[PDB]
Design a binder for these strands. Sequence first.
RNA 1: GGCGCGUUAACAAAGCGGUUAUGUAGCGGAUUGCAAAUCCGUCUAGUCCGGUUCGACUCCGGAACGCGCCUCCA
Length: 405
Amino acid sequence: AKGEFIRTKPHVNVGTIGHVDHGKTTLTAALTYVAAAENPNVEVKDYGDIDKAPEERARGITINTAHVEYETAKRHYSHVDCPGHADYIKNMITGAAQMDGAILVVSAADGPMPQTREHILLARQVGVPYIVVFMNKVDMVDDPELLDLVEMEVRDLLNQYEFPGDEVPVIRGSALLALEEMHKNPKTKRGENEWVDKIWELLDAIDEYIPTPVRDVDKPFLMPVEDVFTITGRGTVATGRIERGKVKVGDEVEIVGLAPETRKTVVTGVEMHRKTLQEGIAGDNVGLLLRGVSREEVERGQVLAKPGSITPHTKFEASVYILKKEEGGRHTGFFTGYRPQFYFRTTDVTGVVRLPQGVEMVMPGDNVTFTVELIKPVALEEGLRFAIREGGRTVGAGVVTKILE
RNA sequence: GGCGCGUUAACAAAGCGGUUAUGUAGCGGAUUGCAAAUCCGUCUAGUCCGGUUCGACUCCGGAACGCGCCUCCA
Ligand SMILES: Nc1nc2c(ncn2[C@@H]2O[C@H](COP(=O)(O)OP(=O)(O)NP(=O)(O)O)[C@@H](O)[C@H]2O)c(=O)[nH]1
Ligand SMILES: [Mg+2]
Ligand SMILES: [Mg+2]
Ligand SMILES: [Mg+2]
């Protein structure tokens, strides 16, 4: 008769991002294990429990995001483990759309790779405010001077995308060794093992660097949909991180974006990690039960909002920076008619570029402003950041400056 | 969420890194006494957006839509 989520401690959303195989998943399992040893609430999550799909089992990689909860002495967490493969960045963006802070995982053996800087840029344009790096796989590095070099380059990479690279906490360690340790003896506490302690160093960094975001509960409700489930006996459920406002049961909301209609529905449920919540407020990784709505009347990319608060749009001008050749972007310029993919929070959508009279071409590494017309409407705001991806690579990072309509 | 499959002109159906495959009706037009048979003409050719190239329907990327199969239970 179920289990309510009591706000004993402040809740913050986190996740793991970084190049493929750098360790994101192992560290996630490691986090739940060490945190559990101290806090008995944390349900342990093993590597197999993270990458559970058969494609992930055989192919040996994280293809879609995984949601895991744990907590320290100070705050509760909702951890979203992201894919590092270049082919599945589409899903990496969706995870970053729910992070109040992100853990940048960088293998000491390889250093900052293509998806390292790619996730920095992307996470930024999807809302991720602060970052906590974690030099993983130190157990494979002999020369200490090399680890210094790794740390230095990761700081430069953060400062390249306007993050506070010099102030960002860089915790060296080894997720594999810490996880292994937690298996042999799960009673292990702080100060008992050096590898386990390096993970506690991490939890402490998260606790002290990533602040508990200012909650905008005074603004109109807005809940970017991240996932849609079909729960037997209950109905259709939407999940995501509340951006602003609050939501108690019996509240009416609109499903805006990716559809001509602006469907209405009443909420018959609200839960934070399988736990019923009184009323989910901003920063909550909820799960709302939508009345009358079917398994396909709502989808990721849309947005649950206060009825009337948002009116979906398609046209808009924005200030954009086209990535350079050596940033994983284009090597050739483009013109009007170019139809790339645009990313606004949990939304991916094709749009057409309309260059202004006076400009004919746009070269890589140029900061330019232009109009865009999406093939579908979506919750847009002046100031909202976004991404432009095409051909498997990110090509531009922009900011909405005026909604044409 | 993932993987696969389908997209050439009004429709049908090919080959090919470059100098015109091709068929078939709907319409138009010569023509017929009027038709018919037969020719002349017609119609978004490579769904769309990028890359390689002197050159792309053809090669490599992406996207849209459609359809299947797993995954997807706060
Ligand atoms: N030597 C060593 N190996 C490690 C460490 N952490 C993880 N590994 C190993 O490195 C490999 C990749 O780890 P991973 O699966 O990524 O935890 P990923 O970044 O989640 N992968 P993906 O990007 O595909 O989602 C695995 O073989 C894992 O066991 C570490 O600290 N040291
Ligand atoms: Mg992983
Ligand atoms: Mg089939
Ligand atoms: Mg459930």
